[PDB]
Nucleic acid binder design. Sequence first.
RNA 1: AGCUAGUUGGUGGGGUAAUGGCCCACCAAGGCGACGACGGGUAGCCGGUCUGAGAGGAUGGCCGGCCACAGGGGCACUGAGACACGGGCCCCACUCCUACGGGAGGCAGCAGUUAGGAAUCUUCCGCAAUGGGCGCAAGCCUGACGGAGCGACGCCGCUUGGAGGAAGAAGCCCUUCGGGGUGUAAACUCCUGAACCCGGGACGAAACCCCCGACGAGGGGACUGACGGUACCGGGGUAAUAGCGCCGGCCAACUCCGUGCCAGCAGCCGCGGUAAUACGGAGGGCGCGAGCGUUACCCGGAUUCACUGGGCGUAAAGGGCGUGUAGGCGGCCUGGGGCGUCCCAUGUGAAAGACCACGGCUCAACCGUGGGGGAGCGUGGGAUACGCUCAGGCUAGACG
Lengths: 104, 83, 138, 99, 124, 208
Amino acid sequence: PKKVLTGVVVSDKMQKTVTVLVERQFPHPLYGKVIKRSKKYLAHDPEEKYKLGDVVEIIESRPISKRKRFRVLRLVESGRMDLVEKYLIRRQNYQSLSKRGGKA
Amino acid sequence: MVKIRLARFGSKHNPHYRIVVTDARRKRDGKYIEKIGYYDPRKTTPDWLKVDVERARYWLSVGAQPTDTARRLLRQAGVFRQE
Amino acid sequence: MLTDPIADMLTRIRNATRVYKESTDVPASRFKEEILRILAREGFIKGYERVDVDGKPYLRVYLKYGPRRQGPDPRPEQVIHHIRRISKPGRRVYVGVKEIPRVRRGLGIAILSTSKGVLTDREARKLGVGGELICEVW
Amino acid sequence: RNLSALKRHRQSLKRRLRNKAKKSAIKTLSKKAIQLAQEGKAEEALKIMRKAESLIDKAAKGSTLHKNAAARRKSRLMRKVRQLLEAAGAPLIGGGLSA
Amino acid sequence: PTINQLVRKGREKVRKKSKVPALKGAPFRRGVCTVVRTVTPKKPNSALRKVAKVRLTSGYEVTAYIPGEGHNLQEHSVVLIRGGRVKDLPGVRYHIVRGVYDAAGVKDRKKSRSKYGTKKPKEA
Amino acid sequence: GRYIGPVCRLCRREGVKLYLKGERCYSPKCAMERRPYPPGQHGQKRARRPSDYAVRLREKQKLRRIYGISERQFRNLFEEASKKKGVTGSVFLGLLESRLDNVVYRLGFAVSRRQARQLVRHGHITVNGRRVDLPSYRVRPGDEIAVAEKSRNLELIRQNLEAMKGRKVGPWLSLDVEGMKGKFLRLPDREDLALPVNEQLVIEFYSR
RNA sequence: AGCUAGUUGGUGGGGUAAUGGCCCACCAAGGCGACGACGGGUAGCCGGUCUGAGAGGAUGGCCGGCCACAGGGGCACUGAGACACGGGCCCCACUCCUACGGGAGGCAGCAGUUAGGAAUCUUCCGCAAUGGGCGCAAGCCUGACGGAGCGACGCCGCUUGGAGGAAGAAGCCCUUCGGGGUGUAAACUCCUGAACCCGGGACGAAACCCCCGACGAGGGGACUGACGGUACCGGGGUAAUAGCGCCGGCCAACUCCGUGCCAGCAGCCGCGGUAAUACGGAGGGCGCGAGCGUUACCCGGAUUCACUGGGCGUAAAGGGCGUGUAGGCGGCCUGGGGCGUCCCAUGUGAAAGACCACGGCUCAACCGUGGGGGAGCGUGGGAUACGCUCAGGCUAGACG
Ligand SMILES: [Zn+2]
C-alpha cells in the first residue's frame, strides 16, 4: 500500500514541486485528548497543475529529490486558502517572537 | 544455499535440537526461516524425534542441502521413502 | 452558553437531587432525553416529560428518592447516589467493549454511546460494542 | 606471520591492472565515437561505436563491469551518439543503431 | 492543569541528588589519608570523634570517618571510603573499612564483629 | 541445614504443642506439660499485648516450624500457591502436605518428619518403586509409597509400621502393614489437617 | 530562537545494481522553525529486564534480532558481495628495529600480560557431537563450539543426624536468697550411615563410508567419544562443619556488670553527663542459615509531578488590569459524507521470556513439546450514537 494522502497546497513558488500541509489527529499517548498535529510534505507536480490553496492527494513515491518523495494523485477541491492564510499566519507571528514577540 | 540443519537448545548435558532452516551464514542457534522438527539425543521420551515433511518437501523443493545428520533424522521419518 | 449540556444536565440533576426537589427541568435536546430514557427507565427517577417553559422546550426530570429516616435527620436516602460526566469534551473518552467497566461492582451503570444508540454497559456487551463513555450513575 | 593466503593482494593487484586497462580502453575509445559522431562522421563513428559496444559487453563479460553496467554504458553511448547525428546524419554502416 | 496545560507542558520529571560524589557510585574507594585530626559534634550531643580526611584514588578527597573504639590509622595508611555521615559532625560524608588495608577492626571486639571488622576468636 | 536443636523449645515459645517431637510429645514429656510457658529468662513473666504484627509473624513461624521446613521454601512455596488457582490458604496446606517426607510421616513409616526426613534420605522410601528421598518431593495424587526393600528388615520401621494398626490414616491416605505400602489418594484440605495454625494470618504476614 | 549555499528545487550529465544534490555544471530564489528548528548535554535502539494493584517509573548485563567499530583520520583496488577485525595505500601519536638510508607492528578473537580499579578466571581438554570452509572422496582446518577448571557471583536440591532420655547434671548469667534460667540440651542407650573404600560402569552415536541394489527408495555391516571411568547401578561404610546480623520506637527479641556529655552508637526522631533494656561483654532472646550483614544504584512506598490519582482566600502556589494572535473549548433541528470513534475477517505481532497443560534429568533450578494471550499496524468489509466535516433551518448564547 504505497501511502496516499489528502492535505493542502500551502505553497508553490518553486520549480515543479509543491508544499503540502497535512493535518492529523490522534489520541494523546497519555493524556487522552486528541491532539491535532501537522507535517509539510513536498509533492512532485509536473505540469504545475495543482495550485496554492488546493486540497489534494499525495502518494508515496520513487524519489525526485531528497526532502521530496511524493506526488499529486489528485485534486480534492479548489479554492480555500482560508487554510493557507492560517498556515501563512502561523509562521507570520513567528519571526517577531524572538526578543520582542510575534504580532496581531 | 538455504540449508536445513540442527541448532542446539538442550542444556549442559541435556542437548535438544530443532530441525530448522537457517542459511548457515547464520549461527546454529540464531534466527531462522522456520522450524520443522525436534530431535532428542538421550531419547528419554517416546517421541525423541518428530518432523513434518508436510513441509520438508517444498522446503527441499528448493535448495537446502540438509545436514548429513539432517537427512539422517529426516530419513527415519524418511522425508524420502517414496515407495 | 453551556460548554457541554450533557454534563450540565447531569448536574442540574445532581444539584437538585441533593435538596430533595420534586423536579428539575433541563433544557430540551435530542440526546439528553435519551440518557434520561435510560437513566429514568433504569429506575433512577420516575421518568421525565417534555415541558415548554417560555415556549422554550425543556425536559422535566422527575427525581425520586428513598423513604424518610430515623433519628436525627429525616432526609430520605438518595436514589441516585452518584453521577459523573466521564468523557467531557476538552478530553474525549471512547472505550471498546472489552474496555467498558463494571460501575460499582455492578450495582451501578455506565452510559456508553455506541453506533447502535446510547446504552448501559450490560447492554453494550449485549450488542457487543463500545463507544463514547458518557455519564456514570450508581 | 606470513599469512600466505594473503596471496590475493598479489592477485588483487594483478587482476586490477587487468580491470583498469579493460575499462580505460572503452573510455578512450568510446569518446572516439562521441567526438566523431558530434562531428558528423557517419561510419567510423557508427563504426568504432560497434567496436566499443562489443568491447563493452566484452568488458561486462568478466567481473569488470558486468551487470546492467554494460547496458548503461552501452545505451548511455549510442543514446549519446544517436541524437548527436541530428546534423545531417544518414547512418551508414548503420549496424550498431537499427532504425 | 487543564489537560491541555498537560498535553502542552506536562508534569516535570524528578531528579535524584546523589549524596556520595565518591563518584562512579562505587561503594568503596581506596585512599590515602592526609590529616587524621579529630572533631567535636553538632550542638545536640558532644564527644571527640576520630575523623580522617582522606585523599581518594579519584581526584576527590573527604573527611573520612572512623568507627570502633580505637584505631590504627596512620597519617599515611591506605584506607577505603564507604558512605555514611554523622548528623553530629557536619561535613563527614563517609565511613571506613576497618579490616581492609591498614585498618583491622578494634582489637577489643566480640559482638557485631562484621562491622568494626575483627575476625573470630578461639574461645575454648 | 534446617533447625537442629532444642525443638520442644520452639513449642514453648511458639506457644502451642509441636509434634515435631515424634513420640513422648504424648505424655508428661512434651515439656509443654508444667512448663508450657515460653523459653528465655523472663519467659514466665507478663507478655505485652502482642504487636498487631508479632501475631502474623509467630502464627506463620508455627505453621513452618511444624514441618521443620526451610523458609526459603516455606516462602518460595507460598508463592507457588498464591500463583496457583484456588483458595490459597488451602492450596498451600495442600501442597505443604505432599512433601514426600511429611507424606511418609502421615503414613506411619516413622513418628516425625525429624526422624522421617533422615529415613527419607537413605532411599528407605519409594515413590512408585523406582524410589526417591529428596524430602522436597511433591507427591501427585494416587501414588505408591512403599518401603525400601533393604529396609523392610528394620526395627524402627518394622516397629513403626508395626504399632501401625489401631491408629487410622487420614481420609486421603491408605497404606497397611501387610505391604508396607501406601497411597496419595488426594490433596487434603484445611479441615482434613487439624493444624493449630490460622492460615489466614499466614496468608497475611506475606503482604508486608 | 531564529537555522540555511549544495542550502530548496528545475533542466542537462556523471556516478552506482538501483532512486537521489549522491556529485558537477548552469537557472530559479527557495527550504526549515514555538506542532521547537539550530546549539549544547547524555545515549547505541529492540526483544525483553527489574519494579508497581496497575497506569507508570527505571533499564537494555548474559541469550535472540538490527547497527556502528577493529590504534585516531581519509581513499580505494579484488570481488556475488566490504571500504574489509587476524587484506592493501597514505596520514598522526606510540613500541620495537637499525650500518641512522630505511623498516615491522594492532588481542574490542580463546587464554594470558601489565596498567587504572571496589572488582570480574584457566596461558587446560576435544574434534565425539552441532555448525562453518574447501573437497568426488578420504579428509584436514575450526580458542564457533561441546566440556572441565576457576569464583558463594545468582538460582534450585543437600548434610551437619535419629528416637528415647532428669521435675531434671556440671560449668555459665538472674535473686524478693524459697529459687529461676541455657535443656531433651548434653553425657549416655540402641538406630541410620554423610563423607570414604571394593567391583561393575553408559545414554550422548548414527550418519559420512563398506556391502545392497539403478552412488534413487528400502537393508545390512566399520569405526570414532573430550567430559570420564564422571553421573549412575549393586556392596561395605564412620554420628559426622555453624555461622551472621539484631534485640529503645517503626520492629520480633530484656536482664546484669561495667559506664560517667567522656568512651562511643546513628537510617530517622535521638541515647551518654552512676539504676542507660539505645555506648562495651556476658546470660539469654528473635530472626535466617552456607550463608548473614554492609556499601552504591533502579523501582516501591511517594496521591510527593497526581492520565488513572494533587492543588492555588490565610500552609508553596492567580499573572498589577486590559485588548487580543496563534491554540484549546462550543447552542437547538434535518440531510450528505463516515476522517476520529466502535465492530468483524484477515495479514503481522520471529525465536527465547513471561501465562498455561502434559513431559524429561530420583526433586527442584535448568530443559522440551503443546496451548493461550499480545497493545500496535496493514488490506476488506460494517455501524453512524458521539466528535469533526460539508449544505439547509431556527433563536434560548452574542451582537444590533
Ligand atoms: Zn514437644
